[PDB]
Design a protein around this nucleic acid. Structure first.
Ligand SMILES: [Mg+2]
Ligand SMILES: [Mg+2]
Ligand SMILES: [Mg+2]
Ligand SMILES: [Mg+2]
Ligand SMILES: [Mg+2]
Ligand SMILES: [Mg+2]
Ligand SMILES: [Mg+2]
Ligand SMILES: [Mg+2]
Ligand SMILES: [Mg+2]
Ligand SMILES: [Mg+2]
Ligand SMILES: [Mg+2]
Ligand SMILES: [Mg+2]
Ligand SMILES: [Mg+2]
Ligand SMILES: [Mg+2]
Ligand SMILES: [Mg+2]
Ligand SMILES: [Mg+2]
Ligand SMILES: [Mg+2]
Ligand SMILES: [Mg+2]
Ligand SMILES: [Mg+2]
Ligand SMILES: [Mg+2]
Ligand SMILES: [Mg+2]
Ligand SMILES: [Mg+2]
Ligand SMILES: [Mg+2]
Ligand SMILES: [Mg+2]
Ligand SMILES: [Mg+2]
Ligand SMILES: [Mg+2]
Ligand SMILES: [Mg+2]
Ligand SMILES: [Mg+2]
Ligand SMILES: [Mg+2]
Ligand SMILES: [Mg+2]
Ligand SMILES: [Mg+2]
Ligand SMILES: [Mg+2]
Ligand SMILES: [Mg+2]
Ligand SMILES: [Mg+2]
Ligand SMILES: [Mg+2]
Ligand SMILES: [Mg+2]
Ligand SMILES: [Mg+2]
Ligand SMILES: [Mg+2]
Ligand SMILES: [Mg+2]
Ligand SMILES: [Mg+2]
Ligand SMILES: [Mg+2]
Ligand SMILES: [Mg+2]
Ligand SMILES: [Mg+2]
Ligand SMILES: [Mg+2]
Ligand SMILES: [Mg+2]
Ligand SMILES: [Mg+2]
Ligand SMILES: [Mg+2]
Ligand SMILES: [Mg+2]
Ligand SMILES: [Mg+2]
Ligand SMILES: [Mg+2]
Ligand SMILES: [Mg+2]
Ligand SMILES: [Mg+2]
Ligand SMILES: [Mg+2]
Ligand SMILES: [Mg+2]
Ligand SMILES: [Mg+2]
Ligand SMILES: [Mg+2]
Ligand SMILES: [Mg+2]
Ligand SMILES: [Mg+2]
Ligand SMILES: [Mg+2]
Ligand SMILES: [Mg+2]
Ligand SMILES: [Mg+2]
Ligand SMILES: [Mg+2]
Ligand SMILES: [Mg+2]
Ligand SMILES: [Mg+2]
Ligand SMILES: [Mg+2]
Ligand SMILES: [Mg+2]
Ligand SMILES: [Mg+2]
Ligand SMILES: [Mg+2]
Ligand SMILES: [Mg+2]
Ligand SMILES: [Mg+2]
Ligand SMILES: [Mg+2]
Ligand SMILES: [Mg+2]
Ligand SMILES: [Mg+2]
Ligand SMILES: [Mg+2]
Ligand SMILES: [Mg+2]
Ligand SMILES: [Mg+2]
Ligand SMILES: [Mg+2]
Ligand SMILES: [Mg+2]
Ligand SMILES: [Mg+2]
Ligand SMILES: [Mg+2]
Ligand SMILES: [Mg+2]
Length: 232
RNA sequence: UUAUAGAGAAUAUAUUCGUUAUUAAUAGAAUAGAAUAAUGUACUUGAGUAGAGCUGCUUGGUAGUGCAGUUUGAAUAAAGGUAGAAUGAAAUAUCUAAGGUUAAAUAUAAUGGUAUACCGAUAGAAAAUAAGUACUGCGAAGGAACUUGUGAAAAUGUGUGGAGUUUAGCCUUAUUUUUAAGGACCCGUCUUGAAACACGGACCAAGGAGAUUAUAAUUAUAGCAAGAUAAAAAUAAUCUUUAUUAACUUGAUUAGUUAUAAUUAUAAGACCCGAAACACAGUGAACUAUACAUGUUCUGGUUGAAGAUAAGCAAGUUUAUUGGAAGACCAUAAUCAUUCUGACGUGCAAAUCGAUGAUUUAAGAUGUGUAUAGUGGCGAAAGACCAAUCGAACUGUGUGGUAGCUGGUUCACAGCGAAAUGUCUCUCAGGACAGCAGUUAUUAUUAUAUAGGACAUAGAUGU
RNA sequence: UAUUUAGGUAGCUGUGCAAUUUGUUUGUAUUGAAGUAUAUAUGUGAGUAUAUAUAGAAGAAACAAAUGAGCCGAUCUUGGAGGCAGUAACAAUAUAUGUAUAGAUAUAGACUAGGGUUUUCAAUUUAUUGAAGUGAAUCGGUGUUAUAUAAAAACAAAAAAGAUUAAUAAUUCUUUAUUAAAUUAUUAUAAGGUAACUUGAUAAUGACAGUAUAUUUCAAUAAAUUUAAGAUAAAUGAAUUAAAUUUUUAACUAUGGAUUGUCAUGAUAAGAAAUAGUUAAUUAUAUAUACUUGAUAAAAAUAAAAUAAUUUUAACCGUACCUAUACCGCAUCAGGUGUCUUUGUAUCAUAACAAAUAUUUUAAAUUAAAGUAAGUAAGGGAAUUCGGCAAAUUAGAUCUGUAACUUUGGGAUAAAGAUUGGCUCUAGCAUGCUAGAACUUUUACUAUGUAAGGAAUCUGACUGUUUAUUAAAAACAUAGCUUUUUGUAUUUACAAGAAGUGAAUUCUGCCCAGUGCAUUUGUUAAAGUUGUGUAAGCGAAUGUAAACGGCGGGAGUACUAUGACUCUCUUAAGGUAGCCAAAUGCCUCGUCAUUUAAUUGGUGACGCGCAUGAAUGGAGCAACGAGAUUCCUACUGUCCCUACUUACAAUUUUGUGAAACCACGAGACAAGGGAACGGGCUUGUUAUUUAUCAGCGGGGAAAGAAGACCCUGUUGAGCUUGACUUUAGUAUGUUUUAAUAAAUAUUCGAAUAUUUAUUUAUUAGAAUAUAUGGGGAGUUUGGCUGGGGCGGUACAGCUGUUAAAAAGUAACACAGCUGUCCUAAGGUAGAUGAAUGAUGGAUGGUAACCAUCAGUUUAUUAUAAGGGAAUAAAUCUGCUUUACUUUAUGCAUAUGACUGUAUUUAGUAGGGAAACCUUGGCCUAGCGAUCCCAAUUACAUUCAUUAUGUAUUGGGUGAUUGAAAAGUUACCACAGGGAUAACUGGCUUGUAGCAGGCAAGCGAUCAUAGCGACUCUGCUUUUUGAUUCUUCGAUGUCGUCUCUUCUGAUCAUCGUAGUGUAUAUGUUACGAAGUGUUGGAUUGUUCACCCGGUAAUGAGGAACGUGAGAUGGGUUUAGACCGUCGUGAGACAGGUUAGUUUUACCCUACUGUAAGUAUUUUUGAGUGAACUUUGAUAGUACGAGAGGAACUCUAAGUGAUGACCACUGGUAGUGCG
């Protein structure tokens, strides 16, 4: 046969990988004050970024919900908690919304980068100095304290309301996000290109649930499912 | 010009260069003599080695013959290694590993010489050289013709002579030979069977296919013979005859050996020409496909969503304007290819021409630059496209790849003359053994003998 | 001394001729060698010798030697030259005197890619030779970069006119300018305005989407004026052409205190209008606003300034010419190729015409046929056809008017009507647009351009894309819906990877037994330790079907009929909601209705559905479609049935001048035999213009291509998988791993294991074992066979028949059997009337047991069949293990293994008194090599244990004298085969068709007017079979259209004869092939069945007549859909839709044309009696009545055929409007 589509797409990512910003905030020993300068828009991502200014140095950050040009925010380990400020994790009471959490201390940020997605805090445990967070995916993860984070819900709202009612709307989405579009179903192909292909009618003939035990080039279909079907 | 010179060239129908035989100059090498320089003390022995366990390659080496990866890793001459089945033990022989140098006898191109039972311009190298040239391919690469005198055949022109219009050419017999009577389908080839409506062949010249080598055997000839011989080299072995047997136990005997020639068998490109394929090493995105950067992309009409203004009727609701949204509607230039199954169909053209059709601000069209290569790329998916080639591109090598299968195989006369049947076979388009044939040889009561016969006698059988 | 022998394919042996070179001997030649061409002699023949002509330098013979040693063929290799043939195919403007007067076709001009002297001139005839020609501080390159080699179109210091040369000119020359660098002369270091700001007085940027509307800057039109030009027989308030001169707004500041603008949306207490003022007005590629987006629209090098002057200061490379007859397609090729500019009329444009500019020289003609284009048609209007394929009708603009349905947006420009010129005026205001009125005519968008309409069904939601060169679609994509993996992402869950269905509306039923997937607690390798112990995986349990998939059958029960209800086999569950003879139903052209004169078609209903059915999605149509199918209206040469005109090729002339093909073709036919369809062979019948010209497609099984279909080959390739053998990747053990201290557990002070802490290590790996592993890699996938496949094994053994009186012998011929059974069913000694029948005997019967008599093989002998045995080879009783060990040989049987079975020398045993018998079954069947493994007996080496050898058995190949092995190809390839199928032909006639002989009976009695049972004998090649003789280096399949000819087994028409013939109307038989046999609906049809009509719609042949005559509907390559089968690639004589039809110019045949005049005769060939009907005969003959003819005589008509233009109709580059 020939090399299929999945392996040929990953080696096309090594010839020209996709490029993004990775915005991080600095670290400062005591509480300082900074000003918001302007709001911009990037090519790949939907959430707008913000340029703040600490000690006559301009950095880049993800914009929170209510933010206007010229406003003042504070950064430090013991800043007061309000909209757009960045404090330590232990100060916030249970029930609020944070949107950039570093895994360890003195890191930029790891969790909650996209627009419209936020996390919640559920508790504090004074023994061993740990707090449990509620991830946007729905899983409870235990975080160590003394990491610092930003208070508020991120901007850009709910983008998934109105559909791509035309085909032309989805053309410019996948082109900016560097994905392959359109896609051909694997049953329509000839049996050289794909395992499911060929035949006299369009059907599969093999079970579509494939274990994870098998090697890398044999993985296709619903890989390693614990369940299949509508629940009710 | 007799000759230490009769090797060979050149001129014309008796002369020269040389051969033969002698010297000189320069460079290099070796041997010997004479002279100049020079001579003290020296007790070293080879470690992450040799060897074991697991694992892979190599050799004739069989249970390592040799080498390497990983783990482990000794003794120092009162010591260590080896001795053609395995391990353990013992005697007798014989050697001392893990550091270094080394002439001669030996193998073969570019470059220059000397010879020959080799070829003589379709031969000999691709090239008697303005030849690795003219010319072709995007590229790796491919690659010819032509000497000087004589003037054959195929195919034509002019002149003279002759027949008839109902019959090409050939054989026999005839002085009615440019006619008469008899005979006579076109050759080669597979085939039970060919003039066949079975295949190859329009015509002339030149070229063109069982030769060479190794190992065996039979026949003819030559030298010596209980022995036979040009092995390498310089001025021994082998065969008669390994005497049998697995071995022990045992054992005389078919004139040979060396060469020359013809035939047969096996292996070498192997009588000549012919596949679809496989591996090694390299070249292409100028056509066409996709992504990224930078530029360019003619003109006229149709319809009427949000938003806004007024005038009526009385929380609102009818009428008239303004406005110009949409993968909305229609045409020219540009683009594509539904139908006539129109034209053409040794074409204008290795895909064109005419009428009729479809198409319009976009998921469009197009120039240039960078990225993607053949068990690989690109793909709104037809196995489509990747330089007129794609269900695995193109160029060179292994390569004169293998063929139980089609085709061809070159002079005369004389003697002799077949099979299409039995058995075994992954055997049925093929092989081997038996049968039928040919050639040569020795010998006579195996004529006191034989017979695809008859007669006399003794019998077998179940149509 | 052949009085005896002599043919011969495949094949074997002997004697001889030809060519090139080598050693020795003998000889020739310039008064002429070798070669070549004609004769003569000689040899049975391969060949040799001589003579004459030509030419000019070396060659011959004998005895021996070495081979690249003798051509008709190979679709053989290279060169030269024929026929067809001067044939096909192409090129062909006018002038009596000209560097001109006319005609004709074509839009034209600049930068780049490519070309490289083609440029210009001279001389000689799109050629040859020779000279000359390209001038740069400001026109390109050289510079910067596109997130470790990138731009002649992105960014960047600066110029224009006017003339010169045979050819260069933003480059030479004249005139007026600009930039940068080096040297000179001179100098402000700040003023002014309340403010916005003005003047020598620095630190700025390169730099960035698309669409719509409003400005009318320039420019261009239009007008006026001034100089000039060209024409008219005439006439014209003065025409036509050329050159120039002219035709307030936006920000900001100061007062002010509440209104005000645009074509549209508005602006203002974060200060409107109105005043006073300061900056600018970006030149159409501009300015200001508005609108669309999960798209927000590149990088880097790069900066200073006042006034005047100077310069042998500004380097290197290219600057000719062509834009298609100077590029690429082998070419002076109807193809292809980036950007820009271009005048006049043109009331939306388009189309068309004219300017401008560039090219160009001489055959004939009122006449062929058949072609390629363009026109017109009386009457009928789809009757032609698979199908309205091709053509025709409609169309612009203004005014009325507009339905069912609906996803409320659409449908809609629906459909259906009416109007349109020219000239003279009137009326509006926005001043070039729109309404109305009068007059007039061979009536008005129509030169060019410009929608036929309506009603239904199947399928796809829509815009979009695709097999460059036979398929544009119902295929692909798409939004929408759903499932799944990942919290250690250069990117961070509204994100990033993997799959299925296919807009909206309404729904998405049951099953976890099978195969997969996930989660969790019996079997299983190596390495290490004195020894021992510990892996994943497989197996088991629980979930999961918008995962692969699946979703039965039989019996009774309420006048007939049916079964709400009941009983019953099993299973994982037994197709629910829906839908249908549908693109899915074989029987099948299902049943009913409707559409038509007539329907296998279309639409609506019915359902025990061969084989429908729910995201492998079911149901459904509003909008959209060069998709597939049926019916109405209009329209027409598609047809009845064809006719006329023009142009270009063709026919006639000159010039340039080919190809396919060719065994021999010298005239053609009927029958015969033959390799079963002859141009040539055998018997018959026949042509001929002085050697032609133009047509045509019957034949040469015509030409192209070593058949793609089918079969064979111990020949291949693409693809799939539960085929055989393995491997990359990955999971899990063991051993290697920095030191230290401590804790805990397991084994016996010690050995193991687990876990924590510190820093003194921390490049991050290495060596082995087990499992998973079509993601990959090699290779295989028997034979026989009345073609192959499916079925059987006729592939190993045994018996009887075929089988023909010695031995031997075939068929997918006949009837059968075999891979077993037995410690006794083996060995031996002895005794013995078996099976059955008759007559009797308490319970006792057809049949229980006991006696008597008879009893030739009927009984038994393990088994298939055949053979053998009656003091028995059978049944009983006793005793035993010959179901042995060693030397030699034979028979099936052979040229030959393995096997079965008879016989021998010498031992050791059993039965018997002894003679004797015994090496498994009474005889003919139950039969297996080389290599390797296991066992038994002997011995062999310095020593123990082991290994290796000789001998005998067992383990086994059933394809049985013996490889280790699954499929598919419609994407396919190679070598071959008429040794072998699909089509024609040939022998045969079971089947098909057409007739005969005899006479039981029917017919009111009567066999034969007319029929005829049970049986029997034939012909024809017209159905379908059976066989495989000719063709696989090719003979073009079914049906239809057009056209000719032939047969009798006669449908009418003609002549006779029977009758169960009164007339009329029938029916049967004999002679007879002259002439007729005609129109439509449905289906690809042949066949079939209806409507209508007539004198009568007869049966058939000619390669199942006829494709270089046509068409292409089905069948039959590559796209695609449904149903059934297969895990899968795939398959279906089950159903659909779209799919390139080549070549005549040879020979022969056929139609015409081609022999000095003028009058005729004879012979030969063709052709030579079509059919219906009115009136009279006549209401007559004949008949109870009803009814109801004929001979003959007049009047017409249809079908065919030969001519003609007085009348009518069609046509018309002849003629007029
Ligand atoms: Mg496909
Ligand atoms: Mg595959
Ligand atoms: Mg489907
Ligand atoms: Mg040593
Ligand atoms: Mg020669
Ligand atoms: Mg040569
Ligand atoms: Mg004859
Ligand atoms: Mg034959
Ligand atoms: Mg024949
Ligand atoms: Mg043939
Ligand atoms: Mg030929
Ligand atoms: Mg020759
Ligand atoms: Mg070859
Ligand atoms: Mg390679
Ligand atoms: Mg549109
Ligand atoms: Mg055509
Ligand atoms: Mg390369
Ligand atoms: Mg396909
Ligand atoms: Mg190609
Ligand atoms: Mg003979
Ligand atoms: Mg053969
Ligand atoms: Mg033989
Ligand atoms: Mg007798
Ligand atoms: Mg003879
Ligand atoms: Mg030869
Ligand atoms: Mg020849
Ligand atoms: Mg020959
Ligand atoms: Mg030739
Ligand atoms: Mg012409
Ligand atoms: Mg020139
Ligand atoms: Mg010029
Ligand atoms: Mg100039
Ligand atoms: Mg120039
Ligand atoms: Mg120029
Ligand atoms: Mg061009
Ligand atoms: Mg051209
Ligand atoms: Mg004419
Ligand atoms: Mg008409
Ligand atoms: Mg008419
Ligand atoms: Mg019809
Ligand atoms: Mg008809
Ligand atoms: Mg049409
Ligand atoms: Mg009027
Ligand atoms: Mg569509
Ligand atoms: Mg095509
Ligand atoms: Mg289309
Ligand atoms: Mg097409
Ligand atoms: Mg689809
Ligand atoms: Mg749906
Ligand atoms: Mg299950
Ligand atoms: Mg369930
Ligand atoms: Mg049902
Ligand atoms: Mg339906
Ligand atoms: Mg009907
Ligand atoms: Mg003409
Ligand atoms: Mg004949
Ligand atoms: Mg015959
Ligand atoms: Mg002719
Ligand atoms: Mg062939
Ligand atoms: Mg074979
Ligand atoms: Mg293969
Ligand atoms: Mg494979
Ligand atoms: Mg076979
Ligand atoms: Mg017995
Ligand atoms: Mg055999
Ligand atoms: Mg197919
Ligand atoms: Mg072939
Ligand atoms: Mg045959
Ligand atoms: Mg035929
Ligand atoms: Mg019959
Ligand atoms: Mg033919
Ligand atoms: Mg042919
Ligand atoms: Mg008759
Ligand atoms: Mg027939
Ligand atoms: Mg026919
Ligand atoms: Mg044809
Ligand atoms: Mg024909
Ligand atoms: Mg067709
Ligand atoms: Mg299935
Ligand atoms: Mg089918
Ligand atoms: Mg007559």
């Amino acid at each position: 046969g020939k090399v299929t589509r999945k392996i040929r797409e990953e080696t096309k990512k090594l010839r020209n990988p996709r490029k993004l910003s990775s915005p991080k905030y600095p670290n400062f020993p005591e509480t300082t004050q900074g000003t918001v300068v302007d709001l911009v828009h990037e090519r790949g991502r939907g959430v707008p970024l913000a340029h703040v200014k600490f000690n006559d140095e301009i950095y880049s950050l993800i914009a929170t919900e209510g933010l206007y040009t010229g406003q003042t925010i504070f950064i430090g380990d013991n800043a007061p908690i309000s909209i757009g400020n960045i404090t330590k994790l232990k100060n916030v009471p249970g029930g609020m919304a944070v949107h950039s959490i570093e895994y360890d201390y003195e890191d930029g940020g790891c969790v909650g980068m996209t627009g419209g997605a936020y996390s919640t805090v559920v508790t504090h445990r004074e023994e061993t100095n740990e707090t449990v967070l509620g991830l946007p995916s729905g899983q409870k993860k235990i975080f160590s304290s003394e990491v610092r984070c930003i208070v508020g819900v991120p901007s850009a709202g709910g983008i998934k309301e109105k559909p791509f009612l035309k085909a032309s709307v989805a053309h410019y989405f996948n082109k900016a996000h560097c994905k392959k579009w359109p896609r051909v179903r694997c049953v329509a192909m000839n049996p050289v290109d794909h395992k499911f292909g060929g035949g006299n009618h369009q059907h599969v003939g093999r079970p579509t649930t494939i274990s994870k035990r098998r090697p890398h080039a044999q993985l296709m279909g619903l890989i390693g499912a614990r369940r299949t079907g509508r629940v009710k």
